[PDB]
Write a protein that binds this DNA or RNA. Sequence first.
RNA 1: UACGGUGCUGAAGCAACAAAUGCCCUGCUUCCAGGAAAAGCCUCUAAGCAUCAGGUAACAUCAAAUCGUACCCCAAACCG
RNA 2: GCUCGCCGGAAGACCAAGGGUUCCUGUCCAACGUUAAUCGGGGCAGGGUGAGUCGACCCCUAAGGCGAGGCCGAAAGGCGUAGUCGAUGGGAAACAGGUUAAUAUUCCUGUACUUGGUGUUACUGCGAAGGGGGGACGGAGAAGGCUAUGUUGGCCGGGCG
RNA 3: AGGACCGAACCGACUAAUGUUGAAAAAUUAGCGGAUGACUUGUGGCUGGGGGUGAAAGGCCAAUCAAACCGGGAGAUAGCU
RNA 4: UAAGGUGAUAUGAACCGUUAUAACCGGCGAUUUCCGAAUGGGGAAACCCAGUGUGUUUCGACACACUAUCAUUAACUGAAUCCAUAGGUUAAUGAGGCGAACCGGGGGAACUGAAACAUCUAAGUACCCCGAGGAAAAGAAAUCAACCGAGAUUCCCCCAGUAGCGGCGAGCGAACGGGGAGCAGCCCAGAGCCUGAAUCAGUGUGUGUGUUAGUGGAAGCGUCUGGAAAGGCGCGCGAUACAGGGUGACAGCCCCGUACACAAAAAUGCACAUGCUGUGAGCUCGAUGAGUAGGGCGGGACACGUGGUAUCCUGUCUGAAUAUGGGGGGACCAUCCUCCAAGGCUAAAUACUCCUGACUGACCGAUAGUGAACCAGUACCGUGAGGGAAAGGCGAAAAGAAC
Lengths: 63, 102, 77, 93, 46
Amino acid sequence: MKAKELREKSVEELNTELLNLLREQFNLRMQAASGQLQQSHLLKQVRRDVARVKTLLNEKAGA
Amino acid sequence: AAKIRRDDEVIVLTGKDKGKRGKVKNVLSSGKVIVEGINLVKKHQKPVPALNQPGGIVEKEAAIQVSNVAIFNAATGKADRVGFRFEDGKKVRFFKSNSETI
Amino acid sequence: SRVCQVTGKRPVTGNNRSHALNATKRRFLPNLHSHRFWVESEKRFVTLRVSAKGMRVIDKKGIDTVLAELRARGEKY
Amino acid sequence: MIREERLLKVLRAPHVSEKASTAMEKSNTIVLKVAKDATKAEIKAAVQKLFEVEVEVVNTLVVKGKVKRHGQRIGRRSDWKKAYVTLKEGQNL
Amino acid sequence: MKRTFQPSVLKRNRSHGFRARMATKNGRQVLARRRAKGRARLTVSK
RNA sequence: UACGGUGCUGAAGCAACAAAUGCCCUGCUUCCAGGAAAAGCCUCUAAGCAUCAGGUAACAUCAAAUCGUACCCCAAACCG
RNA sequence: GCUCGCCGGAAGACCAAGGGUUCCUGUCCAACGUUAAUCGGGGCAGGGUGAGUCGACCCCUAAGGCGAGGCCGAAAGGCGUAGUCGAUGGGAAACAGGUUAAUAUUCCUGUACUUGGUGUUACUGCGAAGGGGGGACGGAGAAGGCUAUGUUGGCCGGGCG
RNA sequence: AGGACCGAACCGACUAAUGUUGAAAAAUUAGCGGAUGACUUGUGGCUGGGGGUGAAAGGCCAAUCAAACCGGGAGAUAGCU
RNA sequence: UAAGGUGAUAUGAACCGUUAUAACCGGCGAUUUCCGAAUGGGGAAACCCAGUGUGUUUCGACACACUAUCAUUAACUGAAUCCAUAGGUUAAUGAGGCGAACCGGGGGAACUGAAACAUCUAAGUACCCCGAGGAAAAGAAAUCAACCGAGAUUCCCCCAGUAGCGGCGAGCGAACGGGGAGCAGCCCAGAGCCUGAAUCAGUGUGUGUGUUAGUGGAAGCGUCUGGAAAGGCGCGCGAUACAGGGUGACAGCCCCGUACACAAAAAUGCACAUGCUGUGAGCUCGAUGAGUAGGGCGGGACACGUGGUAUCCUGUCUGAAUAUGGGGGGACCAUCCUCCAAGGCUAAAUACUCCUGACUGACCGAUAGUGAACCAGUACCGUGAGGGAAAGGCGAAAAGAAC
């Protein structure tokens, strides 16, 4: 009872993972290669969030 | 738990002037603490971009050993030892020889 | 290989010994011949590479008991 | 059925940003760093989907990594794939 | 002067390569000995 | 012109002769020592099917992926 | 930069093998260069290798390798049928200009060519680890007809030493 | 036509000189033999150590050969130094 | 569990976090590219090329799963050849490969010693191969003993360097018997009195109990020298804690600990009515492992070299009796004693350490100790198998030398 990702146990996890990957991670990669500052923690946060949604998609079958 | 925390009024035990007392600013993983105004060293700062462009001999605090640091008691103005005794999973710190919760 | 297929006789290993007792490594081979045995229950011929002692065992015990032992051992024929 | 939006992570960096790439954008092509295992159909679909532009032909090459370090610690940089993506027409921005 | 080493990566891989080692049980013993010694490259040909 | 160089314009652009060890030529002649294999290609039917599936010709459209491609190579980049 | 010499069936140009960034640009001269070095195949940074037509892959096989079953062998294993790999050989197709500091039959311009998928139309017997043809082959010698190429003349531009 | 003749590439190595801590653990220079053939060469394959291969010298088998190299028996043994 | 963290050289940058939800540690899961037994076919490891389904399709195509071989079993087909077998296909289950030593088996040297060397030795050693387990093997007398008796196997100490074997040379070398560690015996070759009626194996909680995170954990101040006190001096205190390590010099009382007392969501190692599944109990009667024992020839193993040589094993050829019977008691024969081969299973004492944890050392201390204190089986060397280094220390703290 040390981490709280019970918030995204709803349906449309495929839509949420699609918004996490489709142009969010992509635009952060384009921004990081063109040069902007804040992306250093945002890239890690987005790839971790993609890992959360993909674990939950493997966990449940209703979404 | 750690006896000396992030913001503790503490007193030095050994080295240079051991009478001075100050507040911890950082606790390092190497078993060392930065206490405010205690190990003033004069670093010869080279010129560099971003911050510290001209450089200087500006004093800076060095890390001192947390064993060389003892906590301070306001009621009895001496160095004191710390114990961890309370009933639940959150153990409070108490002063030895006074039995008062910090 | 040179295996009797009914008595399990393989080449064993011993010595050529002479008058001066010079030991030289030699091997003793089984008296192996390929023989077609007529089986009456299956009404056919079964070819086995067997020793002459193996054919004596086949004559004594019958070919049906022998082939039952070969199926029990799992050996093809 | 244009390829999966998960699979359209092949585009890695927008612009290699030197005189060859900028001269190719001045005349004809965008130059991109596109994955290692990306095929030309994947790069074509990814450019046409993730950008508004239309592409005619994609030319790819594999860049080998260099060593760049002294003999105390010899190491190698990673191989990467460089795509010349031809979309010379119909953009003002 | 023609020297003894005349390189060819095809003959190198056919003679001393990983699959040439794995074909015979003795080359698999060579690979077992090199894994037990701890070589960074099993077949330096490959 | 920062003298790396850039851009515009750009006339004649034909004929004869001599020519290979290259091409026709995997040809021709001759000889004995008597000079790979299989597929691509063409054709024939067997089992099967019959306005079906296929094969031809025309037109239109799509596709041709992946890897190599720098540089040395009678050598200061290969073997010594 | 101007002279002088050297190779020129190479000491020129392009590949294959082999090597693996030595390629180009900026910067540096500790070590490495049998000397100095401002230079470098050296150090450190960037950049640079763009293909339906070139090669590999791919289809096919030679020598040979492996080889279901199989035969043999104390064991390990040896040989080998079907088969499946194996180029150094045999099957589709692109040329000339222009361009980069560094790519080039790949990029650009001009003009093409080949092999498959799908769809429409018109005609119609289509169909195979099968049969046949073809691929498909030696050495030497001798023409003839050419061409790459070269020389000379014409033409054009410049010259008037 | 020819294991024909002369002579380059190519293959080889008869003589001499130099080099002998070499430019080179067999080469350079000046000549020399073959140069359509028992030729020469590229690529790949096969033959494995009391074994192979040898127009045969015990030659060659990775600068190693009257028995390769590596590891092991192994600290063989050494009445010798 | 926590007030600090985002592994290291390695700083920075951008951030996360208050102890009730950052990070760290543990249990259980999720993911786990490609190669490699590599398993769809191939291959020059980390690559090339597919086939069959299901689904999507913007018609460009995409995603996922399966497809190796062998053994066994089942189903359906299926020749010469009518029946049938051989073969073919599908499905289920198992295997494959790796790993340091120990163990069993198949094969098996030579150097050497004999002061040469061939019998002999080295030595059934090295090595090669096969197989298995946490141990393996062996194992419940066709065993010894000696007229008294012991009562399966294994391991240790004696016996004993004995008896013997031996070019009676070199050398090899028991047994009986005794003292110990450990110690339960069973089952089939078969029918009736019995049908869970006691063992054995499997199966999810329970008790007890260890493991995989952890928690609390005593008691020191003044002064001198000194850069620094843990040292000298003085006065106390704790001790079921004076094991150890760090801290600016040598600390029981500064820190981490230590003695002691505890702690588990979950996953896990062992004794039961353990709910059950199967095998299966005790009584009577019967049977008592045949190409076998033995023999001839050639060998091997027994300490035993064929010798006067018993016993075991069998490549070859033979070949009984079968409990009024047979084996052994070291040529052999009588008597006597003792035991039942030709079918199996079986814990413990025994061997070993690739590993994990704790502790120890009249072990080493950077030419030593591992080859490797350090980015070491690395750099280099070799076609390859393979060979194989050198290289530690500023300081208490970078305060790593502004100008």
